[PDB]
Amino acid sequence: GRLIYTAGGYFRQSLSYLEAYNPSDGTWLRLADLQVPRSGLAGCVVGGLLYAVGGRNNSPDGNTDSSALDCYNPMTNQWSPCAPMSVPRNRIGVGVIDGHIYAVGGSHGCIHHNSVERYEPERDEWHLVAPMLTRRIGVGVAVLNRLLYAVGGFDGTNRLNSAECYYPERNEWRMITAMNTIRSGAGVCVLHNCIYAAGGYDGQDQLNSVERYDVATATWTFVAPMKHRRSALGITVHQGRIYVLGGYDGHTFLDSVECYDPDTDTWSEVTRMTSGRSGVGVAVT
Ligand SMILES: CC(=O)N1CCC[C@H]1C(=O)N[C@@H]1COC(=O)c2ccccc2CSC[C@H](C(=O)N(C)C)NC1=O
Numbered sequence: 001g002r003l004i005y006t007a008g009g010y011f012r013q014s015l016s017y018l019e020a021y022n023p024s025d026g027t028w029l030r031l032a033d034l035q036v037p038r039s040g041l042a043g044c045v046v047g048g049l050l051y052a053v054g055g056r057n058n059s060p061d062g063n064t065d066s067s068a069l070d071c072y073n074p075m076t077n078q079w080s081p082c083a084p085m086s087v088p089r090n091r092i093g094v095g096v097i098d099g100h101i102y103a104v105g106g107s108h109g110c111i112h113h114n115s116v117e118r119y120e121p122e123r124d125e126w127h128l129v130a131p132m133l134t135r136r137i138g139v140g141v142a143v144l145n146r147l148l149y150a151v152g153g154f155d156g157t158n159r160l161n162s163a164e165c166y167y168p169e170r171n172e173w174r175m176i177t178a179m180n181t182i183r184s185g186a187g188v189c190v191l192h193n194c195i196y197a198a199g200g201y202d203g204q205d206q207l208n209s210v211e212r213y214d215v216a217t218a219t220w221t222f223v224a225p226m227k228h229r230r231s232a233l234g235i236t237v238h239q240g241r242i243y244v245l246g247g248y249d250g251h252t253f254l255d256s257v258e259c260y261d262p263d264t265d266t267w268s269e270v271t272r273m274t275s276g277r278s279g280v281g282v283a284v285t
Pocket residue numbers: 010039040041058091092138184185231232248278279280
């Protein structure tokens with residue numbers, strides 16, 4: 001019985017919510033709040049423990065970018081602080097390889113990072129690895145074939161359709177086939193050996209289009225679009241299906257939770273979050 005966790009987000013200000021969705025019975029659990037509110041964070045799971053990485057606390061009286069790493073234990077309902085990253089990283093992308101968390105790009109005020117760092121839970125340490133070829137904030141990260149992909153984003157001047165690949169053994173990045181659409185703040189995940197890029201912002205409007213990367217053919221193909229246009233959406237894979245949580249449609253902060261079935265190439269609304277929000281960190285455990 002695995003749950004879909006949603007941490008943080010934004011609705012008028014950065015949020016502290018930690019909530020878990022049970023896709024089996026349709027219930028929502030209210031868990032212990034994050035110690036510091038945060039949006040533009042990323043979530044991941046290492047050894048049954050949930051991690052909230054980077055982000056920013058936007059308050060009506062002041063904004064603070066986050067270098068924080070926090071760990072949630074589902075068994076104890078407690079958040080524990082971990083070692084912080086070298087730099088604050090808002091609109092961060094995260095990926096896990098061999099129980100190691102990679103923190104990809106993000107922003108610190110005026111700085112758009114191309115830098116990448118790796119966390120070792122066993123040692124409680126961050127170390128910088130090779131930086132990306134492109135500075136990317138609002139970047140989608142996916143782990144496929146023990147390689148780390150950085151998809152789309154914004155480099156400080158331009159919204160990107162470009163994507164690159166990290167080889168951990170060789171400690172190097174290579175540019176891959178670019179997407180058909182420019183996407184900053186897309187939901188990026190792996191399902192059945194493919195990378196999916198859902199939604200985002202093309203520099204003009206929020207997108208409902210979804211495309212998947214096939215590694216054997218090195219091509220991006222459009223699949224069924226979502227019912228709602230969304231950027232800063234949370235994304236996860238649970239039991240062979242993609243779940244997209246909340247996001248921003250250009251006016252409204254969505255509470256809508258859509259589910260993609262690859263067998264039928266269809267999206268459907270499965271639930272509603274307790275409240276609408278964007279820039280949530282999502283993981284399954
Ligand atoms: C830049 C901006 O506007 N502001 C002004 C104050 C704070 C910030 C804001 O509001 N951010 C939140 C949070 O989103 C995110 O964490 C996020 C996460 C990943 C990628 C992209 C995003 C942005 S999604 C775009 C949407 C927007 O532009 N609004 C509301 C006008 N911003 C939001 O929802």
